[PDB]
Each structure stands twice: as C-alpha cells, then as structure tokens.
C-alpha cells in the first residue's frame, strides 16, 4: 500500500518506484526522478538486461520497506488495479486492467508480501500477459511474453 | 591590400546590415499576426514573407 | 475556472497566462514561469509593443481553450474579480476590484467569449480604467489609459 513512491518527469508520473526488502526498486525504462528527496538523492545501479534500477534503502526508511518472497505457487495475487492470476509461470490480468504509467507497481501475495514488479504486458484476447521482474532464490530474473509493451 | 581588405569588410558589413534589417522588418511586420489569437496571415503577406 | 494558468516567480504568483483560441497568451511584463510544465517549456514570441507574449496551443494534448470574439459592444463584461463596464471604448472597473498580480486575467462577454486581457489600470475617482489587450480582425492592439500602471 505504502511501498510506492512516484517517479515524475516534467511534472507527470511516468511510473513508480517502491521499497522492497532492503533496497529501492524501480523500472529502468521509466524516465523521471523519485518524488521523495531521501530516495531521490540515492545513487542507483542499472541493468539493461532486467530493465531494473536499484539503490539501498536509508536506515530511517527501513520500516517503510515491504516484505517480499521468492515463492510463487499457482493462484491469485493482489495488486493496485484489481487481482492478478498466476499460472504456468506467467502473470495475467484482464485485458485493459492495467495501463501505461502503471510500471513499477508491485504484485502482492495473500500475506502482503511482494512477489514481482510489473514493467509492462501484452493484450492477447480477453487477457493480458505481464512483463514482470521477480526473484527465484538469490538472483533477479525477467519474465516477458513474446509480445510486450513498456508501461 | 589595405584598401581591398577594408573595402571588402565594409561592403560585407553593409550586406549583413541590409539582411539584418530585412529580418527585423519581417519580424516586426509578421509578429502582430502571430501574436493575435485566431488570426490568419493574408495570402499576399504569407506569399512575400517566409512566415 | 476554464483555461487560466498561474505564472510564478520566486515563491509568489506574479500574473496569469491563458488559452484563447489557438494561442497561449501571457503578459510580457510579468516575470516568472507558467505553472504548467507543458506550457512552461513552450517557446514564446515576445513583443514589447503590446506587452504580450504568445505561443501556439499544444492542442494535441490541450485542445480545451476559451472561445474568442472581435466584437466589443458597449455594455458589461465579466472577469474573475468582478464585472467590468465597457464604456466609450474603454474598460472600467471599481478601484478595489483590481490589483497588482491580477495581470493576465481575461475578460469575457455574456456568451463566455474572451474579448480582452487585463494588463493594468489607472485610478479615476471611484473607478479605474484598465490597460488591456484587445483584438479585431487579424490584428491585436493595446489600449492604455493615461497614467495606467502594470499589474
């Protein structure tokens, strides 16, 4: 809920960054800066392979970090724009359920733990597959449908 | 050398001035049309000036 | 209401900009920038002769703009700080109706159309004449009462 901080460019929100575990995670493809001054001044590292940009969370903001898990059982997960279905290794939401500008939003499990960060997706019939950033054990991996658009 | 170099400079300066005043004249003549909401530059004016 | 934007300098509003017809209008005597980043980054043409800066409205993203007319019949017109009387070809308001910092505010007719932009005014007894920007077919003109001060 309070994981999210806004990323703005020319006064507009172009995506989100949020505090997960011990580090700040944001989409690397999103242009803009973080609204929060304490996070905005952080040095960030980037990986074009994962479209992921991150920095360490300041100690005084440690309590605002969300819980996270690497576990991904088949079932339903929650996020800001309704629910997201996970099966077959793929995260899926109803077509049109998400929009451009929603990148950086976390997906939560039923215990409120962050599972993945949404970067984009593609509309295939009544459902849209998501492009997400998730962790398996000790590394970050990127899951993307054959078709995808950046949000 | 002095006469040719100076005369060339002066003639080029005069041309630069003639051009400079032409663009100033165009800016002054056209601005009032561009400054006015809903205004359309008359064909003749848009024909003679590059706008 | 409608399409009016603030112009800020330092920590204060110094005047207003507005969308009239196909063009963005701002008083040239007002320091500071437009609050809306979409307009702030827009290049303007300045003419000191009319105390006016104008730029084309980015109608591709902001097509909403006030309607305008060249008709200025004797009678009353409206603006944000009250009503303005048009008499003898001059715009007149109560002396306490206007003030420094109100420059850039449009004057509307009873059809909701913009006829003029307020720049300033002069005190004549209990009433003050306004320094305004007005226009007729294809031309913009500036009408300034003697002794009028910029607002």
Tell me whether C139 touches chain B (CB under 8 Å): yes
Search chain C and give the residue with CA nearest A10: C37
Q: Which helix (H) or strand (E) holds B37?
A: none
Mark out chain B residues that contact chain C at CB-CB < 8 A. Answer: 31-42
**Structural tokens at position C47:** 């003419």
Please tell me the distance from the alpha carbon of residue C94 to that of residue B43, in angstroms, as a whole number.
44
CB pairs under 8 A between A and C: 7
φ, ψ dihedrals at A13, nearest 5°: -80, 125
From the candidates C5, C35, C37, which should be mutated to test the interface with A, based on the most A CB atoms within 10 A?
A: C37
Q: Which A residues in the span 11-50 are in contact with C, Cβ-Cβ below 8 Å?
A: 11-12
Rg (chain C; Cα; Å): 14
Please tell me the distance from the alpha carbon of residue B39 to that of residue C21, in angstroms, as a whole number.
9
Please tell me the distance from the alpha carbon of residue A109 to that of residue A73, in angstroms, as a whole number.
10
Please say whether the beta carbons of A84 and A115 come within 8 A. Answer: no
Dihedral of CA atoms B8, B12, B15, B21 in degrees, nearest 10, equals -140
Q: What is the DSSP string of C47-72?
A: ETTTTEEEEE--TTT----B-B-S--
Q: Which A residues in the span 69-128 are in contact with C, Cβ-Cβ below 8 Å?
A: none
Bridge partners (DSSP) of residue C17 are C5
**Structural tokens at position A12:** 């507009």
Comparing CB atoms, the residue among C22, C45, C52 nearest residue B38 is C22
Q: How far is C143 from chain B (nearest CA, A)?
A: 15
List, in order, residues 6 or more apart from C103 with CB less than 8 Å away. C14, C15, C16, C27, C29, C30, C118, C119, C120, C150, C151
Please tell me the distance from the alpha carbon of residue A16 to that of residue A25, in angstroms, as a whole number.
9
Search chain A and give the residue with CA nearest C38: A10
Chains A and B make contact, 3+ CB pairs within 8 Å:
no
From the candidates A8, A9, A10, A12, which should be mutated to test the interface with C, based on the most C CB atoms within 10 A?
A: A10
From the candidates C47, C69, C106, C107, which should be mutated to test the interface with B, based on the most B CB atoms within 10 A?
A: C47
List, in order, residues 6 or more apart from A11 with CB less than 8 Å away. C36, C37, C38
Please tell me the distance from the alpha carbon of residue C6 to that of residue A94, in angstroms, as a whole number.
41
Q: What is the DSSP secondary structure assignment for residue A66, as one 8-state letter?
A: B
Please say whether the beta carbons of C128 and C98 come within 8 A. Answer: yes
Q: Is position A51 annotated as part of the catalytic site?
A: yes
User: SS3 for A76?
Assistant: strand
φ, ψ dihedrals at A78, nearest 5°: -105, 155
């Amino acid at each position: 809920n309070d994981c999210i901080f806004e990323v703005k460019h020319e006064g507009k929100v172009t995506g989100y960054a949020c505090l997960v575990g011990d580090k700040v995670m944001k989409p690397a493809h999103v242009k803009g800066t973080i609204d929060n001054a304490d996070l905005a001044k952080l040095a960030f590292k980037r990986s074009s392979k994962y479209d992921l940009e991150c920095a360490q969370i300041p100690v005084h903001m440690k309590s605002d970090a969300s819980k996270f898990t690497h576990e991904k059982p088949e079932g339903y997960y929650n996020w800001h724009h309704g629910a997201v279905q996970y099966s077959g290794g793929r995260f899926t939401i109803p077509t049109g359920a998400g929009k451009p500008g929603d990148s950086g939003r976390p997906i939560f499990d039923n215990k409120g733990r962050v599972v993945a960060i949404v970067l984009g997706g593609a509309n295939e019939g009544a459902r849209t597959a998501l492009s997400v950033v998730t962790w398996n054990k000790d590394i970050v991996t990127k899951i993307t449908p054959e078709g995808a658009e950046e949000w | 050398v002095v006469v040719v170099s100076v005369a060339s400079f002066v003639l080029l300066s005069m041309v630069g001035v003639a051009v400079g005043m032409c663009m100033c004249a165009r800016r002054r003549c056209i601005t009032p049309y561009e400054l006015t909401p809903g205004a359309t530059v008359p064909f003749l004016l848009s024909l003679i000036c590059c706008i």
